[PDB]
Design a protein around this ligand. Structure first.
Ligand SMILES: *[C@@H]1O[C@H](CO)[C@@H](O[C@@H]2O[C@H](CO)[C@@H](O[C@@H]3O[C@H](CO[C@H]4O[C@H](CO)[C@@H](O)[C@H](O[C@H]5O[C@H](CO)[C@@H](O)[C@H](O)[C@@H]5O[C@H]5O[C@H](CO)[C@@H](O)[C@H](O)[C@@H]5O)[C@@H]4O)[C@@H](O)[C@H](O[C@H]4O[C@H](CO)[C@@H](O)[C@H](O)[C@@H]4O[C@H]4O[C@H](CO)[C@@H](O)[C@H](O)[C@@H]4O)[C@@H]3O)[C@H](O)[C@H]2NC(C)=O)[C@H](O)[C@H]1NC(C)=O
Ligand code: YDE
Ligand code: CA
Ligand code: CA
Ligand code: CL
Ligand code: K
Ligand code: NA
Ligand code: ZN
Length: 806
């Protein structure tokens, strides 16, 4: 109940919310059915429109008008945005030349440059180039400020997950808004676009920017706008708030436009009906900048122009129906569309079985336009698993398609021509970022970056300490003229041991054999040097990774590779080696096919054993440094050490062997040498974070050898590829992946074919940021480069996406 008898007189768009049953006048009362009776009359005035005309100049203040052109309006802070242009001879902001904003030029009593976030729904990255002719205000922001060619949204590329990711710096799995539609089984409650459940605070985790600001004494404009409040009114309200006395004036503001998303759904991303929505957004930008100009704020405010996600061409005829795959279609609930999420329709049905549903959905039709996954097998770069609201079964839908349960759902729910929500690496889903103002750089292009990084920068812009989030603070320092955040490298927690030769071959009873008993001061003094680290500068180019957790591990040196060997997990945490452009690939000699060799630096008790692999009928083994890339026949023996061995399913060995035998040398040819760091990842609770030993769900049978969930590699070279990887004087270039260590290749529908037709495609799907590997391993890479730490943080957030040009 709200007793709507009170009045909004002098309360229009009040900044503090009043609690029921008192009537509300805030920009959200409409959405709650709670506004005072006189809200429309007083707060939503429209009389005479939004623009001054010549004859309105100097008029007598008529309070009925939507905005004013009288002499007193500047002092009242409620002129039409084009007032000084029509009436005082001024130019529109867009018509003025860019001039660098070296320092904030603010009115007295401004403690800090305000931040205005101008968010646009469905604003696809290529609109910046493709609509540039019809968006002069936006093009001026873009060319004069700091801009990225595009900004990567989070998965799923839906509105609520992305706007809340912008506000919090968190992945959807951590903030809790994991789609536009959700079921939480603990609450037994459902979140929907339409309705009241979505307003309950228990959905919204983390700490959004307006709360961070509030708690640290920085006042915030309310971020949310009821749909019926016209854009012109929203702009005028922000500008009015900017005229409040110092003690009352917010420092952070948000504007939101439903466009171009609204029209994009109806007409597709480039339908000819899309030009008008883009003109109109630009006009709104123009009104804001003209209004800031009148208030002398246009060289004071930091403005961020940011989208939530792009838009793709999607029509009703491109829909896949689960009813063409499943017999049991009515025993499932599907969340449908540009992603799929499946759970049992009833928790009382014990005939429901996720494994048979997945199998019925796997590679069933030649051109199938979705792929099923258990959520823990989705590409780790999506970070889409660790939340009870994400169903165990997930469908990744191809761009341009929908999935639905039955045909009746489509024709009894073509209307739409555009949609979004697909994998966040898809070009059509990319969106925009422009930063303009005293704190941003002047005329500066920055590389694409992820929207999870913005919360930190928005905190930097407002002098706030960010709550804990998934951005990497410092990775976007290059966007900023000042207010940079200068982090220190994390402290190493465990120091390595450097074992020498301490065991005799006969102390080992590992059930391993090697044909290696074939026999020199020349070549013995030499191999001693290699085991002491003589070639270490070649294979460890950026210093050793730091171990950021408490553990016991050994550094092992070799001619061709260096490793950090975990005495706890019985295998390396990391293995580092450099492959020059000139390197040669060899085969594993016939005599060495099953050769595994005890490592005399490492106790039998801290070693794997070959018997466990013999007994484990499902599990085989691979090597981290590949024997194919050995520098010489004698060096090859090092690759067969038991301390370079890791457990691998035979299905996975197909992937791994092709990566090591074919792809590494291919990358070395293309990039002028590469440095490779590979290792295992254990993430059995799919939380994106390193497992402790007591979290491991699977061991090689009969042993304490833990089975990795994933294998990673980080492949680094010189950004200037005219310099070889091992003699690089400047910026680095990186690509990484985190491959699921699976007992089958069901994910790859063409895997019966030769590895040259399917392996690289799989690896590309599992592309990753170094930072994702850091979380998963508790390691910290690139500790010793000649590069600034912020540049390295940027490199660690880089994702190689394999999409064509935007
Ligand atoms: C991305 O960045 C984010 C933010 O930094 C990272 O997430 C953090 O990770 C931390 C480590 O996992 C985690 O810390 C835990 O917090 C527990 C208390 O958490 C509450 O309070 C905080 C602070 O205000 C709050 O943010 C939390 O909010 C979560 O939960 C509510 C719903 O309950 C949601 O509304 C909200 O969206 C958020 O959900 C997300 O996180 C939770 C986990 O907390 C997931 O379950 C959800 O799926 C969702 O993803 C909470 O309200 C604290 O209790 C934990 O302590 C346990 O472990 C420590 C080890 O230090 C130990 O000392 C304790 O004994 C304790 O163990 C006990 O509990 C066990 C399980 O119940 C039990 O087995 C034991 O026997 C013990 O009884 C722990 O410190 C932190 O909460 C989240 N923060 C957020 C916002 O998600 C994230 O990791 C980053 N991702 C990547 C890939 O880097
Ligand atoms: C959700 C809420 C907690 O957060 C925010 C809410 C709002 C804010 O006020 N809104 C109003 C609209 C709500 C309803 N809605 C839809 O109707 C919708 C839109 C597009 C669709 N495509 N497909 N289905 C769709 C459904 C999504 C939400 C849109 C954001 N603005 C925000 C602006 C920012 C800004 F500007 F800072 F980025 C940050 C957060 C914001
Ligand atoms: Ca949206
Ligand atoms: Ca984990
Ligand atoms: Cl959804
Ligand atoms: K085996
Ligand atoms: Na297959
Ligand atoms: Zn949309």
């Amino acid at each position: 109940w709200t007793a709507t008898s009170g009045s909004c007189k002098g309360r229009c768009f009040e900044l503090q919310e009043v609690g029921p049953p008192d009537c509300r006048c805030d920009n959200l009362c409409k959405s709650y059915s709670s506004c005072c009776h006189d809200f429309d009359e007083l707060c939503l005035k429209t009389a005479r429109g939004w623009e001054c005309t010549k004859d309105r100049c100097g008029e007598v203040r008529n309070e009925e008008n939507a905005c004013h052109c009288s002499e007193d309006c500047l002092s009242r802070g409620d002129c039409c945005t084009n007032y000084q242009v029509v009436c005082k001879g001024e130019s529109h902001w867009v018509d003025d030349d860019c001039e660098e904003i070296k320092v904030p030029e603010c009115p007295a009593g401004f403690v800090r440059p305000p931040l205005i976030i101008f968010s646009v729904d469905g604003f696809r990255a290529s609109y910046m180039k493709k609509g540039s002719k019809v968006m002069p205000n936006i093009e001026k922001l873009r060319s004069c400020g700091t801009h990225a060619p595009y900004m990567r949204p989070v998965y799923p590329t839906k509105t609520f997950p992305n706007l809340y990711t912008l506000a919090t710096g968190l992945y959807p799995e951590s903030h809790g808004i994991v789609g536009n539609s959700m079921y939480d089984p603990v609450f037994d409650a459902s979140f929907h676009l339409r309705g009241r459940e979505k307003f309950n605070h228990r959905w919204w985790g983390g700490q959004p920017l307006w709360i961070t600001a509030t708690k640290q004494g920085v006042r915030a404009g309310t971020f949310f706008w009821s749909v019926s409040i016209p854009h012109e009114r929203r702009i005028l309200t922000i500008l009015q708030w900017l005229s409040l006395p110092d003690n009352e004036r917010p420092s952070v503001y948000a504007f939101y436009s439903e466009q171009p998303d609204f029209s994009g759904h109806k007409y597709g991303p480039f339908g000819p009906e899309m030009t008008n929505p883009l003109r109109e957004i630009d006009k709104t930008v123009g009104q804001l900048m003209d209004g800031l100009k009148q208030l002398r704020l246009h060289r004071c405010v930091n403005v961020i122009f940011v989208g939530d996600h792009g838009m793709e061409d999607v029509t009703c005829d491109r829909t896949e129906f689960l009813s063409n795959y499943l017999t049991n279609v009515d025993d499932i609930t599907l969340v449908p569309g540009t992603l799929g999420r499946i759970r049992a329709k009833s928790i009382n049905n014990s005939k429901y079985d996720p494994k048979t549903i997945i199998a019925a959905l796997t590679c069933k039709k030649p051109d199938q336009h979705f792929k099923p996954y258990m959520k823990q097998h989705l590409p780790k770069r999506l970070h889409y698993a660790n939340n009870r609201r994400i169903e165990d079964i997930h469908l990744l839908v191809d761009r341009r398609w929908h999935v639905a349960r039955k045909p009746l759902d489509v024709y009894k729910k073509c209307f739409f021509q555009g949609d979004h929500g697909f994998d966040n690496k898809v070009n059509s889903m990319q969106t925009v970022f422009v930063g303009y103002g005293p704190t941003f750089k002047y005329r500066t292009k920055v590389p694409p970056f992820e929207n999870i990084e913005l919360y930190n920068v928005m905190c930097d812009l407002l002098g706030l300490k960010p709550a804990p989030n998934n951005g990497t603070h410092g990775s976007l320092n290059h966007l900023l003229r000042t207010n940079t955040f200068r982090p220190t490298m994390p402290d190493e927690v465990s120091r390595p041991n450097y074992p020498g030769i301490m065991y005799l071959q006969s102390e080992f009873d590992l059930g391993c054999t090697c044909d290696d008993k074939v026999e020199n001061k020349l070549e013995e003094l030499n191999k001693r040097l290699h085991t002491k680290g003589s070639t270490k500068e070649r294979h460890l180019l950026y210093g050793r990774p730091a171990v950021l957790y408490r553990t016991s591990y050994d550094i092992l040196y070799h001619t061709d590779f260096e490793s950090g060997y975990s005495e706890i997990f019985l295998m390396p945490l990391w293995t580092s080696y450099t492959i020059s452009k000139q390197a040669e690939v060899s085969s594993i000699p016939e005599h060495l096919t099953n050769c595994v060799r005890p490592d005399v630096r490492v106790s039998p008790g801290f070693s794997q054993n070959c018997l466990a692999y013999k007994n484990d009928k499902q599990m085989s083994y691979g090597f981290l440094f590949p024997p194919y890339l050995s520098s010489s026949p004698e060096a090859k023996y090092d690759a067969f050490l038991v301390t370079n061995m890791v457990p691998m399913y035979p299905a996975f060995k197909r992937v791994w062997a092709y990566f090591q035998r074919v792809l590494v040398k291919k990358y070395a040819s293309e990039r002028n040498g590469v440095n490779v760091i590979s290792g295992p990842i254990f993430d059995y609770n799919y939380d994106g974070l390193r497992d402790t030993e007591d979290e491991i769900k699977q061991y090689v049978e009969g042993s304490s050898i833990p089975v990795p969930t994933h294998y990673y590699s980080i492949i680094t070279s010189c950004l200037d590829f005219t310099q070889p990887a091992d003699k690089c004087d400047g910026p680095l270039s990186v690509s990484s992946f985190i491959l699921p260590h699976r007992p089958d290749n069901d994910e790859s529908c063409n895997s019966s074919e030769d590895e040259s037709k399917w392996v690289e495609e799989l690896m590309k799907m599992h592309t990753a940021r170094v930072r994702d590997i850091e979380h998963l391993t508790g390691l910290d890479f690139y500790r010793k480069t000649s590069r600034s730490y912020s540049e390295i943080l940027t490199l660690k957030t880089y994702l190689h996406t394999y999409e064509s040009e935007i």
